[PDB]
Design an enzyme around this catalytic site. Sequence first.
Site, PDB file in Angstrom:
ATOM      1  N   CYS A 103      71.589 -49.229  54.883  1.00  0.00           N
ATOM      2  CA  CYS A 103      72.940 -49.788  54.968  1.00  0.00           C
ATOM      3  C   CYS A 103      73.709 -49.426  53.689  1.00  0.00           C
ATOM      4  O   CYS A 103      73.417 -50.029  52.620  1.00  0.00           O
ATOM      5  CB  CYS A 103      72.862 -51.312  55.157  1.00  0.00           C
ATOM      6  N   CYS A 126      78.403 -39.397  40.636  1.00  0.00           N
ATOM      7  CA  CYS A 126      77.859 -38.192  39.985  1.00  0.00           C
ATOM      8  C   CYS A 126      77.767 -36.965  40.889  1.00  0.00           C
ATOM      9  O   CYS A 126      77.438 -35.875  40.391  1.00  0.00           O
ATOM     10  CB  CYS A 126      76.461 -38.468  39.389  1.00  0.00           C
ATOM     11  N   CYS A 183      76.662 -38.988  46.110  1.00  0.00           N
ATOM     12  CA  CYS A 183      77.057 -40.097  45.232  1.00  0.00           C
ATOM     13  C   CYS A 183      78.504 -39.923  44.783  1.00  0.00           C
ATOM     14  O   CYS A 183      78.869 -38.887  44.224  1.00  0.00           O
ATOM     15  CB  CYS A 183      76.136 -40.182  44.010  1.00  0.00           C
ATOM     16  N   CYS A 238      71.598 -44.779  43.237  1.00  0.00           N
ATOM     17  CA  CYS A 238      71.465 -43.357  42.918  1.00  0.00           C
ATOM     18  C   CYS A 238      70.479 -43.169  41.766  1.00  0.00           C
ATOM     19  O   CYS A 238      70.614 -43.793  40.711  1.00  0.00           O
ATOM     20  CB  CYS A 238      72.827 -42.763  42.544  1.00  0.00           C
ATOM     21  N   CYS A 285      72.403 -41.431  38.312  1.00  0.00           N
ATOM     22  CA  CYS A 285      73.390 -42.125  37.501  1.00  0.00           C
ATOM     23  C   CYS A 285      73.329 -43.647  37.608  1.00  0.00           C
ATOM     24  O   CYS A 285      74.018 -44.327  36.835  1.00  0.00           O
ATOM     25  CB  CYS A 285      74.818 -41.662  37.859  1.00  0.00           C
TER      26      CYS A 285
END
EC number: 1.8.4.12
Lengths: 141, 141
Positions: free
Chosen positions: A130, A61, A58, A107, A110
């Site tokens: 995707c 985070c 991510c 995610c 976060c």
Amino acid sequence: EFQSGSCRDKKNCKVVFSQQELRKRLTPLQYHVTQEKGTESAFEGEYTHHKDPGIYKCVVCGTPLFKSETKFDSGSGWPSFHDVINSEAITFTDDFSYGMHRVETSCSQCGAHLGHIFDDGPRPTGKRYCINSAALSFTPA
Amino acid sequence: EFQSGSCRDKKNCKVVFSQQELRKRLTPLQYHVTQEKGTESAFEGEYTHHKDPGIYKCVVCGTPLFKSETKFDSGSGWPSFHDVINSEAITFTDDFSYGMHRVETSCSQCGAHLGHIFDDGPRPTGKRYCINSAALSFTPA
Ligand SMILES: [Cl-]
Ligand SMILES: [Zn+2]
Ligand SMILES: [Zn+2]
């Protein structure tokens, strides 16, 4: 089956950041994609044709999201993956924008918007992710 | 295997149009896509999620290009077909833009840019014709 909504929708994200930090650390495109449900332009993403071994995380985070082993290029305008690194990393939301139904992926730590998942991938998983390059960072193997 | 180039490149299109005529007739978007090799934004095309039976034609010259039976929707940002109405309808060009190699597709009759062809399609052909909605018109059955 899933409860629909990001951890921001559910008000229970484990990781949070101040807007001052986010604005200075993320580029405006990274911010718009991850914080305002934006989509990067097709074929312009940094990782669309990236093949190096490593882990995609991510961008907000730093939680690990995808292994390079599951990445494949078939001509889509955005990065494509067969599987997530573990079942806990991503959360799902029913998305009705643009006159269609999609499942949006975020995610789980976060709440950053990542992209969408589709139920037409090959075995074993049957899935295809995707994902916006602007939502990822890459750590070489 | 193909000789690379549109009929405009090859200086042998069967049909030609005045550029004042084209501007009057096509919207700025249809003009940019078909005459300047443009690409419409993902998910904004009129025919992306269109399912009526009928025939899709070149928006410039009216030549038939695709039958509705071959259209499929796997979540692409653009119309998707697995075969062309007949082998002579489309011409191919090697395209190196965006740091990629793609095969670009154009109308064999007038040279209009249509889209690209990929090898990631379903049976029976294995082909995906990724076609801008702005390059097409539609005639209901
Ligand atoms: Cl786009
Ligand atoms: Zn995160
Ligand atoms: Zn034509």
